[PDB]
């Protein structure tokens, strides 16, 4: 129940404002900046502000804060969802999200803001559907918005029918300083770029553990996805009935399903790091990286970030494989490895100086995070079984998909 | 299939060597298609096994079945899920339609000795589907 959706800037100036109900004065935005400054300086800053009887709930963008004022007991989750949809629409329409496009795309920005939400209740949020009625370079609105299918425009024709899938894995490991992993969860991400003719009804089929158990084949390798979040095109009733994933793919790239299940296996990359930091004399980084993944998979662009001292200077890196560089901007040693074959072992021996004068305040111990990304390797073992592409006209589709394994929240707690 | 013919003798020898009663990860061949075994493909595989021998009358074992499924997946790209048998006790029919292979007693269904027996009626009659309509959807 947002009262006025406005876009701020880094200097407190409102780049664009669009009131939806008018129950909140437009002058309340001026007090948002002092309130945010006071909250930040006292540690009480939150995404949802409160200027007396009006709450300023907004998120932080790349360069401006999309603060949406409200007065009644409006849904905070609804406001956040509307802000996220607006950000996604802006990203789809404008390749950059900064002040350069706010002051240059006002003619289309105002129209998009007016069409997106009326009276604080959003009605249209599909970028592809919205691009057929509001353009910066007007006909009647498309029937897709009025029709039930609001995520697949009818009449789309292509020379070929090729759909590219992307099974992107997110290996997140929360390893404590004691050497044990606390939070080790893998979140799947099935992002497909559907490019077909017409409005095909894709029938996604995978080797799900529940599906295998229901069919009676609960004995082979099946992915045990604890949480499965289907897209808007995916029919919730069909999935709830008999695990049938049937939905109409959209035109372009979109996220169909987002699996998320816990992982009880050993980490793909094991980092054994030591800190022989002398008392204001020197420091040693005996960091060893052990690859527990399969030898047939190579972790391309492996970047194990080792947090070095903030005031360390004149550092020396004695590694074996991969270039090691220290970035003073990040205050850490980036153990960058181009190709990391499975089962390999890279040993590094850091050595950096330290000023004689001790630091005035503590700096903390940021966790060490690795940036391993091994393509063609599915840690969860989930494999796509079938993709039922059915069209009324009748055509031979050529679906495609690739499996990519990377590191998500794979941080290692320091000592 | 020259590759299938070559792999049939080695697969049969490995199955015979394994008695009737280390590397982590799931590597995938780049560009290799993966899909469930079809009824026609299952029928062709059953016919080839019957003609070449080594599968009809062999003692059914978990290790031998797993090795055969892995070899079939490696040589054809078929998932190792269509080589399933109906629950016992007694004669177990193939879960996938078109398969000509079935398990029959040779003497709890787990301790019962079973052997692979060719059955041409499996490719035409859905014995497994009729026995377990719920499992077939």
């Amino acid at each position: 129940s947002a009262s006025a959706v406005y876009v701020l800037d880094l200097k407190g100036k409102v780049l664009i404002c669009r009131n939806y109900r008018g129950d909140v004065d437009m002058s309340e935005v001026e007090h948002f900046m002092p309130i945010l400054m006071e909250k930040e300086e006292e540690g009480m800053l939150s995404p949802i502000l409160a200027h007396g009887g009006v709450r300023f709930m907004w998120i932080k963008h790349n360069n401006l804060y999309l603060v949406a004022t409200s007065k009644k007991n409006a849904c905070v989750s609804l406001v956040f969802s509307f802000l996220y949809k607006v950000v996604q629409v802006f990203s789809e329409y404008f390749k950059e999200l900064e002040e350069e496009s706010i002051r240059d795309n006002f003619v289309i920005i105002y129209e998009l803001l007016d069409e997106l939400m009326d009276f604080g209740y959003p009605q249209t949020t599909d970028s592809k559907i919205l691009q057929e009625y509001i353009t910066q370079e007007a006909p009647r609105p498309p029937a897709t918005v009025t029709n039930a299918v609001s995520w697949r425009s009818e009449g789309i024709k292509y020379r070929k029918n090729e759909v590219f899938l992307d099974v992107i894995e997110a290996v997140n490991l929360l390893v404590s300083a004691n050497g044990n992993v606390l939070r080790s969860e893998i979140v799947g991400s099935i992002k497909m770029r559907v490019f077909l003719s017409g409005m095909p009804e894709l029938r996604l089929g995978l080797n799900d553990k529940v599906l295998f158990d229901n069919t009676g084949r609960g004995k082979s390798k099946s992915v045990e996805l604890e949480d499965v979040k289907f897209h808007q095109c995916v029919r919730l009733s069909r999935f709830e009935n008999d695990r049938t994933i049937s939905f109409i793919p959209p035109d372009g790239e979109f996220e169909l399903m987002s699996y998320r299940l816990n992982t009880h296996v050993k980490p793909l990359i094991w980092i054994e790091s030591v800190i022989e930091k002398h008392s204001h004399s020197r420091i040693e980084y005996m960091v060893k990286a052990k690859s527990q993944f399969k030898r047939r998979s190579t972790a391309n662009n492996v970047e194990i970030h080792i947090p070095v001292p903030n005031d360390a200077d004149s550092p020396k890196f004695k590694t074996t494989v991969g270039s090691v560089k220290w970035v003073p901007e990040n205050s850490e040693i980036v153990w960058s490895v181009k190709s990391f074959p499975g089962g390999k072992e890279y040993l590094m021996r850091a050595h950096f100086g330290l000023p004689s004068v001790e630091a005035e305040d503590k700096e903390g111990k940021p966790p060490i995070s690795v940036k391993f990304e091994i393509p063609y390797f599915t840690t969860s073992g989930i494999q796509v079984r079938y993709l039922k592409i059915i069209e009324k006209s009748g055509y031979q589709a050529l679906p495609w998909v690739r499996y990519i394994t990377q590191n998500g929240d794979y941080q290692l707690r320091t000592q | 299939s020259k590759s299938s013919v070559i792999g049939w003798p080695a697969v049969r020898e490995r199955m015979r060597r394994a008695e009737p009663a280390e590397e982590v990860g799931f590597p995938v061949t780049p560009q290799v298609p993966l899909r469930p075994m079809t009824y026609k493909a299952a029928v062709d595989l059953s016919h080839f096994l019957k003609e070449k021998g080594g599968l009809e009358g062999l003692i059914h074992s978990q290790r031998r079945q797993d090795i055969l499924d892995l070899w079939i997946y490696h040589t054809q790209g078929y998932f190792p899920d269509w080589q399933n048998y109906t629950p016992g006790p007694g004669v177990r029919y193939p879960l996938t339609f078109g398969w000509c292979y079935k398990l029959v007693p040779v003497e709890d269904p787990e301790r019962e000795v079973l052997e692979w027996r060719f059955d041409s009626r499996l490719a035409f009659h859905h014995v497994a589907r009729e026995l377990h309509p719920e499992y077939f959807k």
């Binding site: 899938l165 029938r203 089929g205 390797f377 079938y386 | 560009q31 469930p36 079809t38 996938t96 959807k137």
Partner: peptide, 18 residues
Amino acid sequence: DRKGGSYSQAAGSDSAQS
């Protein structure tokens, strides 16, 4: 070619489940 694993063709449905 493509970084992150070469794209592989997908099947149409579970042919082994009818």
